[PDB]
Design a protein around this ligand. Structure first.
Ligand SMILES: CC(C)CCC[C@@H](C)[C@H]1CC[C@H]2[C@@H]3CC=C4C[C@@H](O)CC[C@]4(C)[C@H]3CC[C@]12C
Ligand SMILES: CC(C)CCC[C@@H](C)[C@H]1CC[C@H]2[C@@H]3CC=C4C[C@@H](O)CC[C@]4(C)[C@H]3CC[C@]12C
Lengths: 48, 49
């Protein structure tokens, strides 16, 4: 992320530069979800 | 009626204490795990590695 016009910096591992390269935003978080993923099989197995 | 239940409960309590001391030592939480080989992704992970 270009903090200034002359010097480029970083937002860190957690944050990412925006599309406009004007700020640092928190990256989306990912986890196992029930919405059409590999979890339907385990859910059915647990229910059975 | 007694000895089997007593022994099983003793083993269960030993394990419960051994894990409760670990949870006391290491506070639970969630971490934003990231990989440099992939990046652009954040994984919400249970604090236990
Ligand atoms: C769920 C856990 C944590 C606690 C409850 C489990 C224990 C205390 C229960 C579960 C099964 C139970 C037993 C089931 C059958 C008998 C035989 C009977 O002639 C006397 C009581 C006795 C011996 C019960 C004593 C209490 C018992 C051992
Ligand atoms: C009388 C009995 C049946 C009550 C129920 C026992 C169990 C479910 C309870 C008793 C004490 C509890 C612990 C007390 C304090 C902590 C510290 C916290 O940072 C993580 C959870 C943890 C480690 C708890 C886990 C659940 C626990 C072990």
């Amino acid at each position: 992320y270009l903090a200034d016009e002359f010097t480029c910096m970083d937002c860190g591992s957690g944050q990412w530069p925006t599309a406009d390269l004007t700020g640092c935003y928190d990256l989306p978080e990912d986890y196992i979800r029930w919405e059409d993923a590999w979890a339907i099989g385990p859910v059915t197995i647990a229910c059975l | 009626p007694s000895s089997q239940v007593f022994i099983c409960l003793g083993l269960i309590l030993v394990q419960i204490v051994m894990v409760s001391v670990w949870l006391i030592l290491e506070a639970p939480g969630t971490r934003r795990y990231t990989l440099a080989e992939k990046r652009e992704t954040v994984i919400l992970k249970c604090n236990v590695k």
